[PDB]
């Protein structure tokens with residue numbers, strides 16, 4: 001006893017075992033998948049009997065099976081008509097990321113702010129605003145320092161053309177889940193027929209020796225440093241100090257003051273080599289009044305100070 005959804009692009013079907021997983025709801029996931037594919041393919045919305053998406057019982061195997069059958073037959077008609085890899089829309093991507101999470105993370109957890117279990121609530125929209133603001137290209141290398149189950153990396157890889165996206169996570173439980181998130185994401189993206197950039201989710205300590213040169217060569221760092229201690233903050237600034245001009249750090253708490261004024265007593269501070277701006281979706285956003293910080297490596301701040309001493 002199972003439910004099957006045929007892929008709109010001819011990939012392997014999505015197979016769900018009945019009784020469906022508890023999770024959000026698995027039956028609603030199947031209905032929303034069908035609706036998303038219908039929104040995506042106008043011939044499919046035409047071929048599909050309208051009534052089948054109004055009249056359903058998620059608690060009935062036969063009712064759920066009939067819904068899947070109607071969709072599957074409509075996909076078959078469309079595949080017969082066509083007989084004779086684009087990036088996902090923002091709406092579809094939100095669905096795909098939630099779907100990937102639901103199929104990957106199965107054990108209870110605590111639902112703290114910006115935690116994997118609440119990604120859909122404020123993270124998804126905020127990461128979407130951030131992507132629109134920093135405008136990465138094929139020359140960029142993106143790294144999430146403390147990537148959790150890899151959700152930010154998956155979103156950014158599905159939305160941008162960076163050369164590569166990396167996620168590094170130290171903790172055992174999220175890094176293990178990231179392995180399933182990776183598989184589930186690649187599988188589901190193929191199922192929908194959607195393109196994503198290259199990415200790697202790995203287990204590791206971003207403060208290790210190996211990671212020193214990796215951070216130095218990164219063009220865009222993403223780091224939720226909100227709850228970081230002074231030691232991790234100090235070590236990170238030491239890593240950032242080796243970054244290239246124009247290198248960027250997107251964070252939840254600033255690494256240098258917004259009003260940093262270089263003088264003779266603060267030449268050791270990271271503020272001497274980076275621009276820092278506070279960004280806010282509120283500056284059409286109706287979500288939480290959130291803020292984030294964009295840091296840009298710029299050693300001309302330090303150069304202009306020495307230049308001004310020699311040229312009064």
Ligand SMILES: COc1nc(Nc2cc(S(C)(=O)=O)ccc2N[C@@H](c2cccc3c2OC(F)(F)O3)c2ncccc2Cl)nc(N2CCNCC2)n1
Pocket residue numbers: 112113114115122123124126127128130152222223224225226227250251252253289290291292
């Ligand atoms: C407010 O409570 C709070 N906030 C944060 N973090 C936080 C605070 C604020 S603010 C100043 O209060 O407005 C805004 C954004 C974030 N996090 C964002 C984020 C971080 C870095 C760059 C960003 C970004 O968003 C961005 F895309 F724009 O660029 C985030 N982190 C992780 C995954 C997805 C997302 Cl989207 N972390 C914690 N914790 C630490 C974790 N476990 C519980 C306590 N608790």
